[model samples]
Target: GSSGSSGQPIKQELSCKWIDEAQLSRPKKSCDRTFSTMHELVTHVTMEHVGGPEQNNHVCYWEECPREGKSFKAKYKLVNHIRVHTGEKPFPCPFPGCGKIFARSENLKIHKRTHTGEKPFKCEFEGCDRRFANSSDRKKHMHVHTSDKSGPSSG
Candidate 1:
C-alpha cells in the first residue's frame, strides 16, 4: 500500500544531523521495496552498521538510560534502539516444538529449518561437512576450515 498523503519525495538541503531528525526525508513510501515491516528497516541499519555513537557521539535518545547510548531521532527508532543491548527480538517463528529465536522475524524463518534438519547449503570442499542456512553462510564456513590456530582468539 502507499505510505499516505505525505509520501512524496522532497528536495531540500539540510545537515546530516537535521536530515536525520526528520523521518519525512525518506524516499516515497511507495518506493520502499526492501522492507516487509518498519522493524526490518530499523534492524537493518542498527544491527548491520554502527551508528554515530561509536566515536563518543550522541547516542539514540529514547530513555534516560545513559548506559545504552544516544537517543534515536524517532520514537519507533527507540523500540529498535533497545534491541541492540538487550537482544530482545519480539518476533518469533511459529514452528511447533522449536525453541529457536532471532533478532528479526526473517532470521527466525531461516532458523526454523533446524528443527527439520534442513541444510539448504553445503560446503563444496571434498571433506568439509559444514551445513548452512544459505549459500553465503556456506562460503563463510569455508574460511573456518582453513583458519590458522596460531593467533589468540577473542571472546
Candidate 2:
C-alpha cells in the first residue's frame, strides 16, 4: 500500500517506526505503514526492515529514535537495539561533574570506580603497590611486572 491516505479504514492501527525513523529528516514524513496488530507491524519491520535482499540495516526505525550516523553492524547493533526498546538507562552517575547514566549495571559499576577513587583491580605482583579502578589498567600493569623480570637461563 502507498503512503496515500485511504478513504476507508479498519483494523487495530499501529504505525511502523522503523522506516519512519530510518528515513528521518524533516518534511519526508514517515514510512506510514500501518498494521492491525503488533504481529503485523513487527513482522513487517522484520521482513522488510531486518531481513536482507533489501533493507538489512540494523539501525532502528522508530519515530524520533535517538540514532545518528550509519546503521549498526548486525552483530553489535542488537545490544543497542535492546537498550532503546527496553527503555532508558537505569543507573545514573551521582558523582559531581559527571552527568551520565548507564544502560547496564556493569557500565555503571566501572564508571563509578572513576569517580570513587577506589581501585579494586590490584596487582598481586610482589612489591607492587600499583592498583587500578579498571581491569583495563590491571592488564597493562601486569605487563609492567612481567617486563621487570628477566629470563636468566634457557638451560
Candidate 3:
C-alpha cells in the first residue's frame, strides 16, 4: 500500500477533528493545540509518530510487502501501518455494475445510487414522497418541487 518514491516525504493538511488523540505519543489533547502552520504539524507527525522511512517502513506493511523496509513518508504510509491492526476493507459496492471499492461504505452507497437511483431516505413534507440518499439531498430536492407545480400535470 506504500507507493511513491522511497525516502521522499509528502505533505498533507488534515482537520484536527479526525486525528486520533490517544494513539499518538504526544499528549492526548495535542490535536486541539492548533499549530501555527500545517507544516509544523506534518513535521511533528513525521518525527514523533512516523519515523524516517528507513526505520518506519519495516513495521508499516505486512512482512510479505515488496516495499518492506523502503522509506515512505505520507499519510497513506501511516494508514498502511495501521492496517496491521484493523485489517479493514470497509468499502464495497454491492450493486451489479460498480467495479470499484472504497474504504468507506458511504462511497459504495453513493456509487450504487448513481446506478440504481434508489433513495431510501425520504422527506417528511406533505404531498412530497421523494426519497434521497440523506436528509440534505431530500432538502435540496424539496426546493425543486416547492414551486407552484402540481407534481406531473396530466396531458
Candidate 4:
C-alpha cells in the first residue's frame, strides 16, 4: 500500500555498445544490444564476450580503454574493469544536485557515507572519538595511536 511498480530505487535500462577488435578500424562491429534489465545486459556481455560460451578471454576489448586491452584471470576481476569503459553504473547517488553515477557498487557504498556522516571506523584508543569514513584512512591513523611518540624526534 505504500508504493507501486511505477518506479524502483534501482533503475536498470542499460545498453551495450562494445566495438569489435577484428576490424581495429572505423564504423567497427558493435555489440549494440540494449536490455530492459541490468541482469540481461550483464549476462549478455558475460556470455558473448566475457566467459560464458563464446570466450574466456577475460580481456577488455573496449575501444576506448586506456589500458589498451588488459586481461584478467578471474571472471569478476575483469567485470568491474569492463564497467569502467561502459556506462554501466548500477549505483547512482540519490543526493540532489550531486547525482553522480558510479560503475561499482563498492564505490557508491563508500561514497554514501559522505552524505550520511556515518563514520564506521572509530579510534580504538578508548579515550578519543576520532572517526573516519574509510578503512584506509583509519588504518593510516593507527600509527598515531600505537606510537605514542613522534618518529625521529625521540632522544
Candidate 5:
C-alpha cells in the first residue's frame, strides 16, 4: 500500500542546515534524513532534535536561537520556536488574498483578525470606542487618550 504507481517506495528527502554555531573548531553539520512520507520526517525531528522526556527544561538547542541557554516550559513551545530557525510554517491562513504562513497556530489565529476585521482589544477610556486587533495597539491608543509623554515600551 505504501508503494507508488510504479510499485516503488515513495521516497522524500528532508534536510536541515545549522545556521549558527557554538564552537569554532567544529565544522557546520547538516541533517539529510530521508523518509517515505512527511509524517516520518516530522517524527524524526520531534524525537531526534526535540528529544524525549529525558530532555528536561525543553531548551531549544537550535543554532540560530540567540538565547543560547534559555529554555521553554513545554516541548511544543520549543518546537514552535525552532520553526523560526527552520522556516517550517505548518499553519496557513485560510482567508483569501492572504496566504501568509505562521509557525505558531496562535499567530495564525491573530492574523485572521486582519481579514475578518475583528478587533478584540477595545480602549478602556470612557466612550472612546476605539478598537484594535491586538493588545499592543490598544496600549498605544491609550497614550493618545491619556496624553502620556512616555512612548511605547519595546517588547
Candidate 6:
C-alpha cells in the first residue's frame, strides 16, 4: 500500500532474524539484521542468507520456510520465495483504486482478477457451483461440499 493523496514515498524497512547453529544446545542464537533500503537488504540477503552457486539446485533452505528439500527449477523462483520472507514488494498494482503490491508477478496477476471480476478457479464438486479468483480460494470452496473442517472460513 502507498501513502494516499500525499506525494510522500512509502516508508519501509527490511528486517529479519536468522538462526545461528552454534548455540543449538543453549538458548536459540539468532542474528537481527535491518536495512533502510531494498538494495542494501537484498544485497545482504544474497551475500548472507543465500548460499553460493556451488550449492546448486537453488533450494531455499531458509529456517522459516516449509518447502523442506523441494528446490525451485530456477534461481529466480527461489529469489521470489525469499521476497515473501523479506516483505519486498517490487510489483505494484496499476489499478487506480488499488494500492496493493506483491513480491511476485504471479501474485500480482492473481490480484488483478479482483478488479476484473475474473474467476479462473472453479469448484470441481459435482453440484456445487462456486468459483474463485485464486486456486487457494477454490480449494477452500471445495471444503464446503466435502464437509472438511480444516479450511479457512474467512478470506
Best by lDDT: 4
lDDT of 6 by residue, 13-108 (tens): 777555544344557655567887887776666556666555575454455665653677777777666776676666577554567788677888
Q: How well does candidate 3 score on lDDT at residue 131?
A: 63
Q: Itemize residue pairs with steric clashes in candidate 5.
A: none
Estimate, for each residue in 1-155, the C-alpha lDDT of model 2 and write its tens digit: 66867675333455555535434477656565676555564455655555543555455555566564257667346434534433334556654456788767798888787776745567767666776645677788776566665575441
TM-score per candidate: 0.26, 0.32, 0.34, 0.44, 0.36, 0.41
RMSD of 1: 19.0
Q: Tell me the TM-score of model 4.
A: 0.44
Clash count, one per candidate = 8, 2, 0, 0, 0, 0
| Rank by lDDT (best first) | 4, 6, 5, 2, 3, 1
Question: Model 6, clash count?
Answer: 0
Check candidate 4 and list the clashing pairs. Answer: none
lDDT of each: 0.47, 0.57, 0.50, 0.67, 0.60, 0.65
The CA lDDT at 101 in model 3 is 65
Per-residue error (Å), model 5, residue 37: 2.8
Poorest lDDT segment (10 consecutive residues) of candidate 5 = 11-20
Poorly placed runs, candidate 5 (over 4 Å) = 1-12, 18-25, 63-69, 83-155
Could you say which candidate leads in TM-score? Answer: 4
For candidate 3, the TM-score is 0.34
Ranked by TM-score from best down, the candidates are 4, 6, 5, 3, 2, 1
TM-score (C-alpha) between model 2 and the true structure: 0.32
lDDT of 1: 0.47
Superposed by TM-score, candidate 1 places the C-alpha of residue 44 at a distance from the truth, in angstroms, of 18
lDDT of 6: 0.65
